[PDB]
Amino acid sequence: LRLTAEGNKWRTDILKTSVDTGREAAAEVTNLDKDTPADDPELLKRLQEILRDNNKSGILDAVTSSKVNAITSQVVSKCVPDGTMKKFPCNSMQAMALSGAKGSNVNVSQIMCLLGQQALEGRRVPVMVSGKTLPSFKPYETDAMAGGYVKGRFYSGIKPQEYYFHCMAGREGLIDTAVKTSRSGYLQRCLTKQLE
Amino acid sequence: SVVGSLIFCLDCGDLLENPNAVLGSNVECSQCKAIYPKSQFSNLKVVTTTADDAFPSSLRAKKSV
Amino acid sequence: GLLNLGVKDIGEKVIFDGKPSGYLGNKLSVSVEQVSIAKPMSNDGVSSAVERKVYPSESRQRLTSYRGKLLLKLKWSVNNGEENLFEVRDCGGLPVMLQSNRCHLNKMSPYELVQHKEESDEIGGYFIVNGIEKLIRMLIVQRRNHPMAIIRPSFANRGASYSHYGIQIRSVRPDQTSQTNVLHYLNDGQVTFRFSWRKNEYLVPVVMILKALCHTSDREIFDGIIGNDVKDSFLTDRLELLLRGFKKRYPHLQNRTQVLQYLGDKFRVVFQASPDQSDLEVGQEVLDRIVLVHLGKDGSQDKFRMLLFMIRKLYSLVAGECSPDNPDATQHQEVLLGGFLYGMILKEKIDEYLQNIIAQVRMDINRGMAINFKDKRYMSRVLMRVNENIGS
Amino acid sequence: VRKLLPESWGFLCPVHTPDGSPCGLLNHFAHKCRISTQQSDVSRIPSILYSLGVAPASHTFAAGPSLCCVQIDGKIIGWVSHEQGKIIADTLRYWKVEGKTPGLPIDLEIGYVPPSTRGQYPGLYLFGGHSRMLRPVRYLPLDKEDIVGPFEQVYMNIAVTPQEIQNNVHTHVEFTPTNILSILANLTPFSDFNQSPRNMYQCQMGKQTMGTPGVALCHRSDNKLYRLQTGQTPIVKANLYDDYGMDNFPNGFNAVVAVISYTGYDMDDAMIINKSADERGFGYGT
Amino acid sequence: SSRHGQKGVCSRKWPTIDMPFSETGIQPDIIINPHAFPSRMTIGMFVESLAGKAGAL
Amino acid sequence: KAQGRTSGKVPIPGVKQALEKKEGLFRKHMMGKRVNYAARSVISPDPNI
Amino acid sequence: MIVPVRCFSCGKVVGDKWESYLNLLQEDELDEGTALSRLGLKRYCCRRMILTHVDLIEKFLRYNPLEKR
Amino acid sequence: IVMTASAAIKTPQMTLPIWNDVSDEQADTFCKSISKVLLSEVIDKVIVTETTGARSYVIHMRFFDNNEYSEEYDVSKEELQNVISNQFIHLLEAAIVKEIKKQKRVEANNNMNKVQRDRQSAIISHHRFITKYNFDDESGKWCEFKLELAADTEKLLMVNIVEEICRKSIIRQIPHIDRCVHPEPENGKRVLVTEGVNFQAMWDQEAFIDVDGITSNDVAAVLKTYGVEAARNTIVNEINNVFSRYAISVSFRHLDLIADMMTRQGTYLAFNRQGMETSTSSFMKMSYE
Amino acid sequence: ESVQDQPSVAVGSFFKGFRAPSDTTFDLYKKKKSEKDEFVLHGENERLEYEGYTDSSSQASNQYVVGLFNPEKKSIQLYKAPVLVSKVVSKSSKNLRGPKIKS
Amino acid sequence: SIPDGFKKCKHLKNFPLNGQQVWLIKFPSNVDISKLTTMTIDKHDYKIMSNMTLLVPSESKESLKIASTAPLQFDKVFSVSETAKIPAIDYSKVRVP
DNA sequence: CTACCGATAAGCAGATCTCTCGATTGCGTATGA
DNA sequence: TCATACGCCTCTCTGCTTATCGGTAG
RNA sequence: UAAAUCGAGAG
Ligand SMILES: [Zn+2]
Ligand SMILES: [Zn+2]
């Protein structure tokens, strides 16, 4: 599961460029000019209206999710295959992912390089009524870190806020998994009763 | 006593009946029975405008922001 | 204690007998003023003397419950203090819980706990019933004493009010018992108070209670709901609609006394009242028993002010001036402790016990007995003819 | 209803929940969440508020969200401006944290909602009643412990670690980040390295283990008991494992594990246990 | 099960002789397939194994 | 279709209620029955069969 | 409960070493590692058996049904 | 699709294939022409003035700027005035009289032209209790009309009913059509999609839309207007495109059998008791439910 | 420059812009307490009854002071006046009631 | 209707109003009235910066009358608000690495 | 003019895999002891 | 005085079905 | 040997 020194250097250098991605995405969504400060009163007001509404929030979440997904794709592409301390076939994780024995490249990426952005239902993490995603974060925080985009990995561990966001995502996943099995049963039963 | 369409009694503070539904030329309070002549208040004018979130239109988004 | 506050706020339940005595013969006013639970003890057969001490280890081994005696003293009052007959009546063994103040392990050190066969670090918080451990699970309920702007389609859908807005408040009496008030909204420009005294629900115009709580003028209501917001045409129009609707529907109620009388004779059968309570008295009773209980009796001015605040909040909500409060967000939630539920159930069981003895007296009235309320023999005869197993 | 809201930060455990039908509904409390069970002394609070600039509610002529309605457990105490209400909220929190004012109990929750645009209804809300939810956090001024609740928390900035405190932003900080987790979630070793659907599986499964229920089993008549004959304290364990005195009830054993594909009798989830170890008492129970 | 939600029924009582012995002579008392880890990503188990080995040493 | 219930404990199911729902006679006793000569247990792997 | 007689992984007898380990910890100021090394437990499989033992038997013995408390 | 035979599906649309010779220009214009526009979509605000000096009601219908709304929605000031004077007041008076029945249980208007005065008098005669009417015949920016009413009635909101009337008023709409967006072509297919099903409307627009390849998401409308076999084809296509989007392959024999069973009577049947009773064997239905 | 703790004036609160004829007059009361005494203001007229109280839950926590100020001098004459919350009842409507019990 | 102990005040001091600005100062009970914005009084800091109806003694100085000219409202209103000290944290000892 | 025929508005009825444990079972009353 | 038998003792979807307000011919 | 309700679980 380890990386090389140069692989970690690449990963951290690319992740350093994700600091302003959230602010730029928010500014683009609110139609504000780029390079605007993250604490601009007009930007804060526009994000306030976006949070109050439910469609502007969805648009902003989709745009920021696309940006952070581009960032994580860059990180994974540059680091996963040619940054590992052990290479295939010596790397058992990589061999298992590539040969289809168990797991996949997304699992290997989450373990080794980046855990990506947490999506609850095609959307970022929920927001309080005060514009705060968590007590640890500013109101109307224009930061990908305070949007569910966790920069940690399961090899080096995840910070507390990232842990909370990932717990949210896991809970939604388990709820949907529980629901779908009961959902399909009535459809199958009616189909087979008529077509038996 | 008079703020909008409402008329209040300056003595007790009860809603006086609408002057357009009384005998005429005067209306009295239903509690103090004080004399309120129909003069001194004839323009019961209210101005109201719809909320900003009442007419969601495509041009509404583009006119601002 | 919560139990003492509950029996104090229960009040006295009154019955009459036919013995010509303005209303019906003499008066009986049964009430409870002290509920005491004792630590569990064993009679050891009939030996008695100094009672033995029971322990949870003994309860577990015997495969029975671990309960202590429950004591209530009845204030058998005849003709409003003419002749009072106090009597402490046991009500069976109330299951007590471990490590509580009414348990025998309340302050025992770990060495003593090991000596008494419990555990090195035994923790209570549970009841032993029929030799089987049990626990009253903590439940999440609405936050007390807070009016929350709530938007719900289930209001207009199958609601007597026609809107999906409202302002719900779950007030709790000082004896830890809840009574919720829903400030519904109507599409035609008025607000209807809603509550559920018994298992059924009732609706009352809000301005009714607004005038009934304290002596008020219509200008006072306008001031309370609109503070310097004279230019707010929305608020002024809604307030005018509400006041005109009240004056049109109830032109007779020009005074607090007669609006209270109307409330009283509207709520007379359900709020069980003897043929002694006047309409004004029973109206004040239902007012103190239903609307804004968390401010308690003798808080009519505070109830009036808080009702004005609730109305302003509802109008601001329907005007889009404030977001709805999420019922399921933990920000707007509290937890029912589990012992408070025990207190509520004890208060209701005491109420049912008092109503049962009064029903026995009424059955005696319907039949033909000596029915002398001043006779200790008759009082003990009617007290032994009613089930008293509150502990059971 | 089952969504993990961010308003449960430090009150409800994000991990501790039973996967399946009761998921999200049967949650558990954080191990440091104190539930108030008594009514705090709120007699002197109205007297303090009036001195701080609150106009009396009896004679105020004020209404609407444009004014900060100060309440105490559901009683309208007075009215004040929004900025003044914020100042009173901060001053009340300071006086509550510091141990000099007699009228203000530390358990009192000062919930303040500043004005916004179509936000929550504003006003200064004070609570001291029973059944409240309380959590200890470190008030950054005076470095002293403070008590907050869910209603007051969602409007206040609280850094998760002392290294992330920002200038003029954070006024509180968690004592440790690990007090937002429940028991059986703090006890999971290296819980920040697993997928969350595995931390929650471990939380659900730590209750089903055949450990030791108690030591007084000779004086109990329980219908069914699951006893582990020989348990061991973990080599790797959280600092809270001995804080709660959990070594009195060992739950399992330390086994020499080999992450190896050798036997061929374990692909999906199966496991292979040494025969000789089993014959030596490994994992025995009654 | 382990402390990271790794379920699994015991499959066979593998005799000690057939168990893969190490250089020091330690024959593990529990074998867990390496394929269980990539999908669940329970790296906490990997950290815990070596941390416990260092602690026991 | 029964009329008359003040408090009660449980309303006795009619003959119709014995044949109607998922727990009724049809879906529980002819569309699926408990079977003789059948076992059930936990599965463990075996690459040698 | 009481100390296992044999180490699970290999089979070395560690049932005669719990009291010695406790004495080495109490009387002398020996660390757990040094005490285990002195006892003769070189492999970590043997070391864990005495290092992580709980000894719940002492807690169990306080509940004696055949002696007056 | 399969288990309820929803004739009122949540999201009905058609696929309109544009001709190969029509560019994006004259296509977006066609979309704006076919899309539905409401009266509320163009009103900036309304300023209701109530006076009892008998119960008058002066409504000032502020409008969006002409140079932008006539380009966004392709609706002219003449059409705006026509729809107002023909439907807006007609609905407003009906709502007002219904409210009364239930209860009982910019400044240049003085400088006016002869044509405008005649129009105002005509609309006053046409409608019930309107005392004045004017329109911005040179800018299309406002439309005032007094609404003097009887003084015996109580106070009325006159704002939350004007909101509803504006939102329910139709400026230019074809039945069962809401919006017509122009999505990016999938693979060489110039596709125009709508938000509703009404085939006969697009049959007239042969110049822009190739009427032969009009395929709709809805099945009941396809069955009603094209026949049973087209309904079976669209059933198969809809039940397949959901699987394809989820990267799951189901052989078309299964979907063909399902569609043929669903349209075995020439009607859009379903797999429920309401589409089950037509069966020879009764025990099967009794065992079903 | 000179405070007057002794009862000189008092300020009431009926509603916004409460106006009464100049012939109307009120009477003041004073309980026999030590500090922060409760005040009751009484009055009557031809057909209206005027009354007021002071809320003890707030009158003992804050003080209200009236005063003057010269335009060219800082000489301020302090005057302490309590605040009374008041209500207005019509004399004819004050005795208005109904039947005790409706049979 | 005289409540118990609420004796009618025999006499009241004259309250001059003609001859001119009328202000209200909502002094907290803690502030000493006898001894007399960043004003400093006693040993604590304070913030100083038609609602009610005013009454004035009549000629008989045994009753209350509403003051008016030829009504009269207070020219200015002040509320002495008690303030505390909120000190900035020491970031050097707060942000421990 | 007025009856047959429709076109909503409202209410009504019926729906929304197996397996293992454990616990529990009513008041209310009224007359022969 | 007092026990066991008799008498009861509040936030989802699809249709179908009935009643009631409009219209056309005779 | 039953039958219903509630509670706790496994896949
Ligand atoms: Zn009056
Ligand atoms: Zn060994």
Draw up the topology in text.
The structure is cut from a larger assembly and holds 3 copies of chain A, 1 copy of chain B (65 residues), 3 copies of chain C, 1 copy of chain G (69 residues), 1 copy of chain I (103 residues) and 1 copy of chain J (97 residues).
Chain C: H1 2-10, E1 13-16, E2 27-30, E3 32-37, E4 41-42, E5 52-53, H2 56-62, E6 67-78, E7 83-95, H3 110-115, E8 127-129, E9 132-134, E10 139-142, E11 148-149, H4 153-156, E12 166-173, E13 177-184, E14 192-195, E15 202-205, H5 206-213, H6 218-225, H7 233-249, H8 256-266, H9 279-290, H10 300-318, E16 333-336, H11 339-366, H12 376-383
Antiparallel strand pairs in C: 1-2, 2-6, 3-6, 4-5, 6-7, 8-9, 10-16, 11-12, 12-13, 13-14, 14-15
Helix pairs in contact in C: 1-11, 5-8, 5-10, 8-9
Chain G: H1 18-26, H2 32-39, H3 44-51, H4 57-60
Chain J: E1 7-8, E2 23-25, E3 40-41, E4 44-48, E5 53-57, E6 64-66, E7 76-78, E8 80-82, H1 91-94
Parallel strand pairs in J: 2-7
Antiparallel strand pairs in J: 3-4, 4-8, 5-6
The structure holds zinc ion (2 copies).
Chain C binds 3 DNA and RNA strands through helix 4.
Protein name (chain J): DNA-directed RNA polymerase I subunit RPA34
Modified residues (Phosphoserine) (chain J): 29
Subcellular location (chain J): Nucleus, Nucleolus
How would you characterize the overall build of this protein?
The structure is cut from a larger assembly and holds three copies of chain A, one copy of chain B (65 residues), three copies of chain C, one copy of chain G (69 residues), one copy of chain I (103 residues) and one copy of chain J (97 residues). With 196 residues, chain A is an all-alpha fold. Chain A has a single domain, classed as RNA polymerase Rpb1 funnel domain (Topoisomerase I, Chain A, domain 4). Chain A contains seven helices and no strands. Chain A has helices at 5-15, 21-29, 41-52, 55-79, 92-98, 105-112, 160-195. In chain A, α1 runs antiparallel to α4 (55-79) and α2 (21-29) runs antiparallel to α4. Chain B is 9% helix and 15% strand. Chain C has two domains: 1-124 and 338-392, no CATH class; 145-326, Alpha-Beta Complex (Dna-directed Rna Polymerase Ii 140kd Polypeptide, Chain: B, domain 3). Chain C has helices at 2-10, 56-62, 110-115, 153-156, 206-213, 218-225, 233-249, 256-266, 279-290, 300-318, 339-366, 376-383; strands spanning 13-16, 27-30, 32-37, 41-42, 52-53, 67-78, 83-95, 127-129, 132-134, 139-142, 148-149, 166-173, 177-184, 192-195, 202-205, 333-336. In chain C, the strands form five sheets. In chain C, strands 1, 2, 3, 6 and 7 form a five-stranded antiparallel β-sheet that branches. In chain C, strands 11-12-13-14-15 form a five-stranded antiparallel β-sheet. The longest helix of chain C is centred in the last third of the chain and has 28 residues, at 339-366. Chain J is mainly beta. Chain J has one domain (1-97). In chain J, the strands form three sheets. In chain J, strands 3-4-8 form a three-stranded antiparallel β-sheet, with no helix packed on it. Chain J has a two-stranded parallel ribbon with strand order 2-7. Classes of the chains: A mainly alpha (196), B mainly beta (65), C alpha+beta (392), G mainly alpha (69), I mainly beta (103), J mainly beta (97). At the A-C interface, loops of A face loops of C. The complex binds zinc ion (2 copies). One zinc ion is lined by residues 7, 9-10, 12, 43, 45-46 of chain G. Chain C binds three DNA and RNA strands through residues 130, 132, 134, 152-155, 157-158, 196, 201, 327, 356, 363, 381, 384-385, 387.
